[PDB]
């Protein structure tokens, strides 16, 4: 009875612009490293100072890159401050002031000759993207029909990887990745923010937020009826009234409370672990260093191979989308972790043997592409939307603040620790990721419940049922 209306597509698509922003700002900074380091050097000396040492330049560059994650840690953790006060839709509209501000700091830092503005820009756009990674799956999770909640939740990741791909393409030297236009490469982030801000007033508020948080049952029902193209929404409305009664009977949920309450501990531990399984897969280490590895394996044009990876990244997100309601979250997440374990292992083996057996070069190239395919089969999309599935209305903002922050914090740690680990371990460094992949494969199989097609009420009651034992 519930259809996919133009209204629903529009509301979800508009939400995923935030996803695009996350992906774009993640990937964009990589291509113009040399150019930006030149800018940093030219700025220091133009201001009278001595030219920076290679160490200082590296430090200032690493800061420009990493400060984005720091902002993301802060932003993701702060989503609880917004979504209950302003609502989900209005939160997304409001924080675009951050996107535009951040983008202007980056777009203007060069002409302003300000390394500080660049760093500040990346911090602010980090804050924005961190809020987005929380806002978007929360919104999509609360407006999607139950039977398509996973598929629609995968559109979040799809926007992210399209963001990354567009970032890679713009980053080409004959596009925006030149010494003249790189401020525009960074400042581009303002355009999606302007577009999304114009469209967001015409998106509905979460009917779940309206009914359960604001006790506006009639408003919620009318929204549902339009969004899903049917007058008959009694099943969903009554589920929401059930959640409303629950929320009124439970204390206001805090972050610390999630680790205290047995009923909350199981899903938050699952939520957190599943974020680590995404980041501690090594996906961002692999993707970033793919260019160097491709080159070392003999790819004559390693940049085009890395764009090829980004294309593979996109194609298999779409595959996940058409498979997550049929196969379920468990199966897809486990296939991806397992397949990535195979490939990261194969990266180590091929890299160890390629100088003695040159055919292993091609295996190394293949292992990277296939790794990326396995990543988007499950561990890419699922952890971003599944946290919204594991909680009822009351705990969900605080949980997604905590989970989201754990996702950002672990990507920070990987960025921070991988180069040192790579230095000492060489090719063996990927066995570290293999270890995490295998550990989380076991965790998933044994500890992660199937959430496909189930109401939040069922899932929550099951967790409570287990907590009663
Ligand atoms: C003179 C030639 C100059 C060329 C300069 C060498 C390029 C540096 C490598 C880019 C990898 C491309 C990957 C970009 C897309 C994926 C981004 C990503 O996932 O990583 C997060 C980010 O890198 C956190 O460090
Ligand atoms: C050569 C290319 C020319 C273009 C250069 C100027 C672009 C102007 C638009 C900027 C807003 C950003 C575009 C909007 C991106 C939306 C992301 C998105 O919707 O992703 C798909 C999602 O998965 C579905 O739900
Ligand atoms: C469940 C998945 C996780 C399980 C993980 C298990 C790891 C599997 C890796 C095997 C690498 C073996 C490859 C060895 C192939 C022989 C290499 C060789 O002899 O190369 C000669 C060739 O002519 C070149 O020039
Ligand atoms: C019902 C569950 C269905 C889930 C769907 C799972 C899809 C996961 C991705 C598989 C990629 C291929 C994996 C098999 C290995 C083939 C490797 C290969 O042929 O790739 C050539 C390589 O690119 C040379 O450069
Ligand atoms: C929950 C557990 C999951 C965790 C994930 C599984 C980790 C397994 C990998 C261990 C790597 C072995 C470490 C070996 C330490 C030797 C390092 C060393 O001494 O390297 C010197 C280098 O050669 C100087 O250039
Ligand atoms: C290179 C080749 C390696 C690629 C393959 C990686 C290895 C692990 C893959 C699949 C195991 C898990 C999927 C099969 C079992 C899933 C069934 C399950 O546990 O889910 C039950 C739940 O009720 C659902 O509805
Ligand atoms: C301290 C230095 C490290 C700084 C890292 C700066 C970028 C951090 C963003 C990590 C996003 O990771 C994405 C992941 O969430 C999933 O959407 O899949 C995507 C791949 O397609 C991943 O890019």
Give whole-number Cα distances, 118 to 45, 111, 298, 344, in Å. 17, 11, 35, 35
142 is in an annotated binding site: no
Q: How far apart are CA 131 and CA 22, in angstroms?
A: 10
Q: How far, rounded to the nearest angstrom, does the alpha carbon of residue 344 sit from its chain's CA centroid?
A: 21
Q: How far apart are CA 79 and CA 412, in angstroms?
A: 19
Please report the atom of ligand 5 found closest to the CA of residue 433.
5
**Structure-block tokens of residue 377:** 């089969």
Q: What is the CA radius of gyration of the chain?
A: 22
Q: Is the CB of 33 under 6 A from ligand 1?
A: yes
235 is in an annotated binding site: no
Of 359, 433, 442, the residue with max ligand 3 atoms within 8 A of its CB, to mutate for a pocket test, comes to: 359
CB-CB contact of 291 with 302 (8 Å): yes
**Structure-block tokens of residue 453:** 């097609």
**Structure-block tokens of residue 283:** 């996906």
Residue nearest to atom 20 of ligand 2 (CA): 159
Residue nearest to atom 15 of ligand 6 (CA): 331
Please report the atom of ligand 3 found closest to the CA of residue 341.
3
Please report the atom of ligand 7 found closest to the CA of residue 416.
1
Q: Comparing C-alpha atoms, which of 306, 332, 344, 330 is closest to residue 432?
A: 344
CA angle 385–277–381, rounded 5-degree value: 30
**To 10 degrees, what angle do helices 115-143 and 96-108 make?**
150
157 is in an annotated binding site: yes
**Structure-block tokens of residue 440:** 């989380």
CB-CB contact of 276 with 406 (8 Å): yes
Q: How far apart are CA 247 and CA 84, in angstroms?
A: 13
Q: How far apart are CA 426 and CA 449, in angstroms?
A: 37
238 is in an annotated binding site: no
Residue nearest to atom 11 of ligand 3 (CA): 346
How far, in Å, is the centroid of ligand 2 from the Cα of 220?
30
Please report the atom of ligand 7 found closest to the CA of residue 23.
23
Residue nearest to atom 5 of ligand 1 (CA): 31
Of 159, 176, 177, the residue with max ligand 2 atoms within 8 A of its CB, to mutate for a pocket test, comes to: 159
Q: Comparing C-alpha atoms, which of 19, 10, 12 is closest to residue 384?
A: 19
CB-CB contact of 368 with 309 (8 Å): yes
Widest distance between CA atoms in the chain:
72
Please report the atom of ligand 5 found closest to the CA of residue 438.
3
Neighbouring C-beta atoms of residue 438, cutoff 10 Å: 16
SS (H, E, C) the chain: CCCCCHHHHHHHHHHCHHHHHHHHHHHCCCCCHHHHHHHHHHHHHHCCCCCCCHHHHHHHHHHHHHHHHHHHHHHHHCHHHHHCCCCHHHHHHHCHHHHHHHHHHHHHCCCCCCHHHHHHHHHHHHHHHHHHHHHHHHHHHHHCCHHHHHHHHHHHHHHHHHHHHHHHHHCCCCCCCCCCCHHHHHHCCHHHHHHHHHHHHHCCCCHHHHHHHCCCHHHHHHHHHHHCCCCCCHHHHHHHHHHHHHHHHCCCCCCHHHHCCHHHHHHHHHHHHHHHHHHCCCHHHHHHHHHHHHHHCCCCCHHHHHHHHHHHHHHHHHHHHHHHHHHHHHHHHHHHHHHHHHHHHHHHHHHHHCCCCCCHHHHHHHHHHHHHHHHHHCCCCHHHHHHHHCCCCCCHHHHHHHHHHHHHHHHHHHHHHHHHHHHHHHHHHHHHHHHHHHHHHHHHHHHCCCCCCCCHHHHHHHHHHHHCC
Q: How far apart are CA 123 and CA 119, in angstroms?
A: 6
Residue nearest to atom 17 of ligand 1 (CA): 27
Resolution limit, Å: 2.3
Of 341, 435, 444, the residue with max ligand 5 atoms within 8 A of its CB, to mutate for a pocket test, comes to: 435
Q: Is the CB of 370 under 6 A from ligand 3?
A: no
Q: Comparing C-alpha atoms, which of 14, 400, 2 is closest to residue 204?
A: 14
Q: How far apart are CA 145 and CA 149, in angstroms?
A: 6
Q: Comparing C-alpha atoms, which of 45, 29, 4 is closest to residue 415?
A: 29
Residue nearest to atom 7 of ligand 1 (CA): 31
Of 67, 75, 160, the residue with max ligand 7 atoms within 8 A of its CB, to mutate for a pocket test, comes to: 160
Q: Is the CB of 342 under 6 A from ligand 3?
A: yes
**Structure-block tokens of residue 25:** 């700002």
313 is in an annotated binding site: yes
Residue that is written with structure tokens 């199966």 in the block: 331
Neighbouring C-beta atoms of residue 302, cutoff 10 Å: 19
**Structure-block tokens of residue 167:** 């970032």
How far, in Å, is the centroid of ligand 4 from the Cα of 386?
24
By the 10 Å C-beta count (0-12 exposed, 13-18 middle, 19+ buried), 13 is classed as: middle
279 is in an annotated binding site: yes
284 is in an annotated binding site: yes
Q: Comparing C-alpha atoms, which of 422, 297, 437, 292 is closest to residue 364?
A: 297
Q: Is the CB of 443 under 6 A from ligand 5?
A: no
Break sites following residues in the chain (C–N > 2.5 A) = none
């Amino acid at each position: 009875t519930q259809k996919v209306t133009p209204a629903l597509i529009f509301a979800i698509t508009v939400a995923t612009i935030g996803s695009f922003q996350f992906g774009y700002n993640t990937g964009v900074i990589n291509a113009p490293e040399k150019i930006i380091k030149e800018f940093i050097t030219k700025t220091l000396t133009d201001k009278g100072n001595a030219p920076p040492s290679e160490v200082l330049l590296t430090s200032l560059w690493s800061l420009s890159v990493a400060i984005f994650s720091v902002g993301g840690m802060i932003g993701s953790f702060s989503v609880g401050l917004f979504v209950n006060r302003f609502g989900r839709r209005n939160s997304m509209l409001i924080v675009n002031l951050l996107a535009v501000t951040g983008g202007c700091f980056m777009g203007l830092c060069k002409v302003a000759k300000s390394v500080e503005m660049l760093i500040l820009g990346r911090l602010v756009i980090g804050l924005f993207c961190g809020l987005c990674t929380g806002f978007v799956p929360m919104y999509i999770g609360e407006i999607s029909p139950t039977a398509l909640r996973g598929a629609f939740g995968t559109l979040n990741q799809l926007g992210i990887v399209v963001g990354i791909l567009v970032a890679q393409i713009f980053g080409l030297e004959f596009i925006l990745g030149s010494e003249e236009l790189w401020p525009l490469l960074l400042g581009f982030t303002i355009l999606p923010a302007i577009l999304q801000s114009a469209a967001l007033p015409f998106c509905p508020e979460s009917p779940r937020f309206l009914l359960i948080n604001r006790k506006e049952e009639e408003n919620a029902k009318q929204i549902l009826q339009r969004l899903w193209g049917t007058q008959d929404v009694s099943q969903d409305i009554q589920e929401m009234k059930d959640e409303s009664a629950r929320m009124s009977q439970e204390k206001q949920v805090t972050v610390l409370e999630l680790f205290r309450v047995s009923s909350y501990r199981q899903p938050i531990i699952i939520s957190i672990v599943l974020q680590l399984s995404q980041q501690l897969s090594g996906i961002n280490a692999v993707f970033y260093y793919s260019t160097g590895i491709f080159k070392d394996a003999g790819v004559q044009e390693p940049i085009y191979a890395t764009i090829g990876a980004g294309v593979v990244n996109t194609i298999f997100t779409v595959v996940s989308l058409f498979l997550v309601e049929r196969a379920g979250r468990r199966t897809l997440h486990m296939i991806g972790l397992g397949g990535m374990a195979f490939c990261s292992t194969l990266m180590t083996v091929s890299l160890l043997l390629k100088d003695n057996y040159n055919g292993m070069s091609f295996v190394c190239i293949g292992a990277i592409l296939v790794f990326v395919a396995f990543f988007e089969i499950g561990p890419g999309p699922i952890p971003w939307f599944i946290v919204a599935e594991l909680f009822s209305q009351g705990p969900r903002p605080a949980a997604m603040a905590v989970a989201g922050c754990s996702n950002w914090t672990s990507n920070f740690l990987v960025g921070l620790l991988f180069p040192s680990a790579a230095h000492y371990l060489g090719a063996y460094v990927f066995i570290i990721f293999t270890g995490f992949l295998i550990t989380f494969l076991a965790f998933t199989f044994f500890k992660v419940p199937e959430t496909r097609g189930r109401t939040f009420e069922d899932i929550t009651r099951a967790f409570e049922g287990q907590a009663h034992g």
